[PDB]
Amino acid sequence: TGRLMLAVGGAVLGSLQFGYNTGVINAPQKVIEEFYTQTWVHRYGESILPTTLTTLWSLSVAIFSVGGMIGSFSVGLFVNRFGRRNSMLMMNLLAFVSAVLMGFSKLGKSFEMLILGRFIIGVYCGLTTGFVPMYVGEVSPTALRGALGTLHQLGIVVGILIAQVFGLDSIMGNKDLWPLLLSIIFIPALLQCIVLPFCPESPRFLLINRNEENRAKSVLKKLRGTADVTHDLQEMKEESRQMMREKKVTILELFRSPAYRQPILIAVVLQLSQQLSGINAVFYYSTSIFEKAGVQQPVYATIGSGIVNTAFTVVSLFVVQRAGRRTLHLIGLAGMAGCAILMTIALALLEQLPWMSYLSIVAIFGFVAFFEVGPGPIPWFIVAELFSQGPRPAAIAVAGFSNWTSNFIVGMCFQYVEQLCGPYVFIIFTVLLVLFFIFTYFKVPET
Numbered sequence: 022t023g024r025l026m027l028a029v030g031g032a033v034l035g036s037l038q039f040g041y042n043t044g045v046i047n048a049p050q051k052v053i054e055e056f057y058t059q060t061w062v063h064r065y066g067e068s069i070l071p072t073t074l075t076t077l078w079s080l081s082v083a084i085f086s087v088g089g090m091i092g093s094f095s096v097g098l099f100v101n102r103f104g105r106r107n108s109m110l111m112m113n114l115l116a117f118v119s120a121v122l123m124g125f126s127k128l129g130k131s132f133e134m135l136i137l138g139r140f141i142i143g144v145y146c147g148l149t150t151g152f153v154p155m156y157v158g159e160v161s162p163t164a165l166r167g168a169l170g171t172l173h174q175l176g177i178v179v180g181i182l183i184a185q186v187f188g189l190d191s192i193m194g195n196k197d198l199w200p201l202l203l204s205i206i207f208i209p210a211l212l213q214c215i216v217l218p219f220c221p222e223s224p225r226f227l228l229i230n231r232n233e234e235n236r237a238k239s240v241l242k243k244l245r246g247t248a249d250v251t252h253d254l255q256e257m258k259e260e261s262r263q264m265m266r267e268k269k270v271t272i273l274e275l276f277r278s279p280a281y282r283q284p285i286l287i288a289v290v291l292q293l294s295q296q297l298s299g300i301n302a303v304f305y306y307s308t309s310i311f312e313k314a315g316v317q318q319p320v321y322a323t324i325g326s327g328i329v330n331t332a333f334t335v336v337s338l339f340v341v342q343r344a345g346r347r348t349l350h351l352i353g354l355a356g357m358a359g360c361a362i363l364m365t366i367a368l369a370l371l372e373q374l375p376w377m378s379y380l381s382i383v384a385i386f387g388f389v390a391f392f393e394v395g396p397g398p399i400p401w402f403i404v405a406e407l408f409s410q411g412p413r414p415a416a417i418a419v420a421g422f423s424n425w426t427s428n429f430i431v432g433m434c435f436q437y438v439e440q441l442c443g444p445y446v447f448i449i450f451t452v453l454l455v456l457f458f459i460f461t462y463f464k465v466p467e468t
């Protein structure tokens with residue numbers, strides 16, 4: 022466990038990037054929108070329509086996920102064909118070409134470049150949800166493999182908290198320095214783009230995929246200071262027993278077969294339950310939502326949501342090993358439904374009672390807290406237990422496809438639905454939260 026941390030850490034750097042680019046565009050929205058609306062006027066000799074600006078900026082945050090879906094679709098392709106590290110490494114090209122397209126959308130005078138770079142860094146982020154946990158989950162000793170996949174999660178949530186903090190009016194969330202905010206990705210990226218060639222090609226890859234018995238044999242002795250493991254080698258050839266003794270069923274079979282048509286119904290819904298709960302609304306729009314409430318200095322309440330989120334991600338790890346699977350998923354769903362009620366109250370009585378600005382903050386803090394213990398981790402956990410070593414991969418691509426899809430819908434349409442619907446938006450998310458809650462009570466089993 023010496024040279025190992027180098028490889029693990031450099032990998033997670035890309036889960037950080039996932040953490041950033043996701044929770045970035047939520048603190049400096051009206052700053053770019055001012056860029057949007059001014060750009061429009063100069064160009065088209067006409068001023069921007071409010072709804073235009075809305076769907077336009079909606080697409081800038083949304084088109085991220087169109088990207089990530091494709092990214093997560095293409096994950097299997099690069100991994101097997103190129104190894105894990107040679108993929109992490111080469112995909113930094115995506116990180117750089119998007120960093121440039123956004124951070125020079127400044128004198129570019131083009132919000133296309135901004136949306137495009139958002140797409141591309143969506144692809145990069147889609148691909149990276151697959152590369153990272155994989156790599157970390159072959160490199161690590163099987164014992165420490167549990168406590169170390171922890172870093173892909175943590176990487177994201179911390180990655181988020183940074184996007185928010187860097188987002189401050191006083192850092193890079195301001196009329197002058199928001200392209201360096203959207204671009205500073207490169208400083209993480211180039212770092213990994215340097216660390217990585219010092220990092221080892223996956224042993225389960227050199228042995229099973231690349232069929233190098235001796236070249237793979239050599240990686241571990243470095244990767245493990247004083248282990249030199251016959252146990253790891255027999256495991257890799259027993260992992261290539263069970264993962265290769267049950268046929269890798271394709272996604273396309275999952276659907277055609279009635280045997281699977283039900284387990285797959287559950288896994289998928291669980292993903293809708295995660296995104297259609299309405300979180301990325303509080304993580305794409307935290308600041309705009311806190312404003313409209315009555316919050317003064319809304320980005321701090323955003324970073325409030327940042328800290329609380331990271332806090333309960335760590336608390337979840339403990340509670341997750343302890344309790345049932347749909348225990349946490351229910352309690353999690355519950356609080357979130359009730360918090361989205363507190364919200365719609367605050368957002369409602371705000372006008373008669375000022376300090377509901379505060380109730381907004383309370384609502385959402387416990388609402389993201391309640392999230393990370395429940396619908397956060399549980400719908401992933403359940404798929405790995407709803408499918409054996411054979412249909413399990415096919416199962417994950419569909420899961421991840423629901424996740425990137427219900428994500429696009431919240432991101433693209435949450436602004437649609439805050440205008441036409443007012444301080445009741447969280448009653449939409451409360452009606453879902455209930456439905457979902459109900460669904461899991463009668464249809465999803467313990468695991």
Ligand SMILES: CCCCCCCCCO[C@@H]1O[C@H](CO)[C@@H](O)[C@H](O)[C@H]1O
Nearest residue numbers: 043174178300301304330397398401402
């Ligand atoms: C055993 C595997 C466990 C998987 C752990 C998942 C941890 C929860 C992370 O979920 C993510 O939370 C973000 C905010 O925290 C959202 O922006 C994002 O859309 C959502 O997907």
